[PDB]
Design a binder for this molecule. Sequence first.
Ligand SMILES: Cc1cc(-c2csc(N)n2)c(C)n1C[C@H]1CCCO1
Ligand SMILES: Cc1cc(-c2csc(N)n2)c(C)n1C[C@H]1CCCO1
Ligand SMILES: [Mg+2]
Ligand SMILES: [Mg+2]
Lengths: 546, 546
Amino acid sequence: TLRAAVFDLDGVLALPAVFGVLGRTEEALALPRGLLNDAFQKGGPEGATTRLMKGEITLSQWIPLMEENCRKCSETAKVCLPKNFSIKEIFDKAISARKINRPMLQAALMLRKKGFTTAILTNTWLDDRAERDGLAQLMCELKMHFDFLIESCQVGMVKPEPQIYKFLLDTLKASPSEVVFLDDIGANLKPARDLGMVTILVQDTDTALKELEKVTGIQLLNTPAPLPTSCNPSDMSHGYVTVKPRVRLHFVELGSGPAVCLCHGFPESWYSWRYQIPALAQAGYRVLAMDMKGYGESSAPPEIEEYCMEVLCKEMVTFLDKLGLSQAVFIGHDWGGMLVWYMALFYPERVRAVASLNTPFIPANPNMSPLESIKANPVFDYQLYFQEPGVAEAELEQNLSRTFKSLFRASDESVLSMHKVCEAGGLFVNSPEEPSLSRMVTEEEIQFYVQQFKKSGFRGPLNWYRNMERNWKWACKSLGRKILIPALMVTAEKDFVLVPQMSQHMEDWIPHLKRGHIEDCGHWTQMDKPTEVNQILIKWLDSDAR
Amino acid sequence: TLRAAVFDLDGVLALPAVFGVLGRTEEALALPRGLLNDAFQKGGPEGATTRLMKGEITLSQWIPLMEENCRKCSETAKVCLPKNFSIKEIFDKAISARKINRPMLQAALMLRKKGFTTAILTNTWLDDRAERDGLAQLMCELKMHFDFLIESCQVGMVKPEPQIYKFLLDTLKASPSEVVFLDDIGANLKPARDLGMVTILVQDTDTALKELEKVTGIQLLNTPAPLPTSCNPSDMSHGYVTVKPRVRLHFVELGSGPAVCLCHGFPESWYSWRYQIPALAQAGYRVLAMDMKGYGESSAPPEIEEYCMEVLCKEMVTFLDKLGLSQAVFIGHDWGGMLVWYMALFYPERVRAVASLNTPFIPANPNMSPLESIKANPVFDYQLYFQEPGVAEAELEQNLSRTFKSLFRASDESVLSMHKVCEAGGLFVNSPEEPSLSRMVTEEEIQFYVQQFKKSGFRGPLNWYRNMERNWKWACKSLGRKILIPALMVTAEKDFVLVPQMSQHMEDWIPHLKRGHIEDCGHWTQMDKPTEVNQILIKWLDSDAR
Ligand SMILES: Cc1cc(-c2csc(N)n2)c(C)n1C[C@H]1CCCO1
Ligand SMILES: Cc1cc(-c2csc(N)n2)c(C)n1C[C@H]1CCCO1
Ligand SMILES: [Mg+2]
Ligand SMILES: [Mg+2]
């Protein structure tokens, strides 16, 4: 029966509520109880506050009107307001104090995931104060999680007037009995109740969630910890930069602050960062999540040498030049990880800080051909399989779904040993035609990769492995250097190819290296353990790159 | 004969030179003359400094080696270095002191404009110091003006070794006699001279330019003031954001820092900001230059109401939401100017600051239909001509070249009165078939507009004028408000439609409004007077939006 859920902002999705600051200020300053609330509410439907909430005036215009109300209320109550008493001050403080009430948001999200239409209906104001950016941030963060946001000041109507509830119903395209509405102000619930909406009076959050859960029949309290926000591709800003005549690079871009360029591994996509992109933007960064050369909407030229580390890095520099970015933080995974260590070594002036997931920095061995070095570790045998042009392409392109479904698996699910792949004759020779779906991914997410890979297939991707000799000679030039910019290495316990021990000597080349470590994490770090990756990146960004 | 020009960075394109800081520090600290230069040069081809310039070691690794050289030089000269003596300190200071030597850059630019290939050949280092971003900025700003940048540390070779000059010649694809090479170090010129290159020894800039001018036969000194840098479309980052199912918005994006969204007028393009985009990025801003809805690579739906101010503003808010931007500075011109005043009035929380070129803020008159208000000023008669769907489209689309060439004219060139356009039967009824080219634009620039307008023509653009009644009713809601965020109004003396007097009452609605005024400037402000626009925007941005 219930199809829709409506939440107020103050006192419901965000806490502490501003009205609360009226109460507290009175208490703190020993003013007559309720004096501030009388001033706030003076003139009722035609007083300053209603005009504010309806959009007739802006917040900065209302401030001196509330001031005047406070004077008149205090003269009528035969008291004086203290020296320094400041309405602007009180509200600046109150509005920055108010934070997202996380469990209410997570309930709204769960309800939306089970197919509810969700909305925020709020009495609010046009905010033109010097510090308005703080509220603009909160509203952005909240509203992306909901179907609709209805603000009194944008629509010219306020709770409890009946017309806003009619406007609500019409926006929802639902009848009143299909709607639950939560509010901390009982007067605001009444007209919803009159129409036959389920209403919940929100005092403490848990009891409201308990009622919300009873009435919807959905579990909202004590639920497992949810994944971070992911990205819908068609909701993103897509950027494109031509770095030379045949080569354009595509990226997705979210947030403001220091530029952070995310570089995925093989055979992946910008979308492999879907769980980090909103979190890093939310934490105060400008994220640029690349399709690396060879992939997705980036160009994919056929020639092997187009994909050696030197050419790749030079193009990433050009990509910064054309965007007008003197630096970025570079964060890489797998092949992207190797590339970011090379950026740090050859273009430290362009790199604000460098981090890798899984991929250690290993210096070239000038006394050993890289082919031999690769042949020395049985777990890299899949890289020899990748050498011969055409062979891996045919296997990987033959059935894309099966390809991504076989590759993208958590450590407790794996179907492919990386073991004696040449000898066996292929990566999939002993995996099913139709693999089961990993817990890490949905069917929809697999089909995003399949559709990406239909544009250019695996030639350009595989070519990143086909420049061992060329990369080795370029790397040998850097053998006297050290990496002395801020650097983070993140090892994954159960990546059985890029094993955490393989990073064990990095402090010789990177003496101030920082570390994080993720337990029970396979090769596909960002989607295996997105919460833990997010926390380790944001903590290191805030301390080292900011 | 000469086809190419090569410039050193230190002492040639940037000043004061670092070597100079060796001299000055000695003098300042009363050290033995030349002591620092001996330490710097110790071991010659195999000393620390050469290894640095060749890329073997990074700057931070070299710092303690130069320190040690300075100790050994001072022990051998029987003196002591002062307490606090700091090589890191000296170089931090020297490297931030060094600025682009503007007249040398402007000579290189002029030579490139007359078809020279230009290059920077420099002995430089891999810079990993905490403060490296300053040099990364200088190198970005310089290098975008040149065909090639050749850095000793990237190529593994240093002036004066002969191999780098061979590498130079090969990069230029020129024989030595086709090249002029400028350097402040005579030892560095010699191998160019040995090959038969024209060389110039740069002491003071003017005498070097004088020799450069004699030898090339091109005027480089005492030249008129050049235009600001413009944008090549195919060198820009292009961004695309879907703000709702039928509507995607395209923009060009350059720079980092506070987001600044540029909104062009009718019938224009992101490209109309070509002279502001590099300057504002260079001044420390993130520029987003839109194709407004109706234009260029943005969607262009046919329906009139898709283009009312309300829908337009809501979509600009969504564009911020999807990019993850809690605010931007909004700067508009003509129709874009009207739109930014509306953003300031309806979404002040999303607007960091607002500026308009030409377009004044005028409140709706609630006692007069907007059609009448328009009929009251003979100079708006072209807006009535625009009302009837199809009529203006046919005239404007009939011959695009003639359209843009007739419209885009400086005030001393105009071919169209805005006068009794309905009565005359068209905007062009009395202008030539093939207008002459305005001084403001090249043939190439006109053809960029023509090609943009072949995608959707003039329907969507004209529709911005066809919502007078709808805009009037929306505007009436804002009649109690004031604009109290930072605001700049820029009037143009000779815009005979949007006249500077029309802005004269703006202080009633915008009490802290700032102003700039541009004399001898017609309607097409950004390209008429790009230098003056740039200076007024950047000064106001730095003081009000930063
Ligand atoms: C960690 C690592 C070691 C080597 C290696 C060793 S010797 C040689 N030539 N290469 C390579 C190529 N990697 C990169 C990883 C990331 C994905 C590709 O393998
Ligand atoms: C300055 C201005 C006044 C009016 C106006 C007056 S009364 C009414 N309805 N409109 C308009 C539409 N403008 C906007 C300019 C910029 C380009 C379009 O004209
Ligand atoms: Mg409330
Ligand atoms: Mg020099």
